[PDB]
Amino acid sequence: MIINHNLAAINSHRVLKFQNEEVSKNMEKLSSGMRINRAGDDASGLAVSEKMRTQVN
């Protein structure tokens, strides 16, 4: 066994950090109640949404 570096720990940590990032992404939109909150999730969708917001106002 090689004990200087633990590769399974590194793999599990990477998977954990990306799962946590996705959890935070889900949680922020669950709190806000909107599908898109900041740009990059759906740029065209956000632009169309702003257009219809101006239209309804």
Binding site: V23, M27, L30, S31, S32, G33
Partner: protein, 55 residues
């Protein structure tokens, strides 16, 4: 005069007086959303507790 008064009052009421149905619909929507928001805040508050499992 008693016709001009009622017309002006109708106009002013349209300008300034609210509508109860729309206001209460918005109130119910915002109440539901704030309940969901506080539930999710409570859920997220306990989220970082899992790190102690590997300590």
């Amino acid at each position: 005069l008693m016709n001009a008064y009622e017309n002006t009052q109708a106009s002013e009421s349209r300008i300034r007086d609210a509508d109860m149905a729309e206001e209460t619909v918005a109130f119910t929507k915002n109440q539901i959303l704030v309940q969901s928001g506080t539930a999710m805040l409570a859920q997220a508050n306990v989220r970082p507790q899992g790190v102690l499992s590997l300590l």
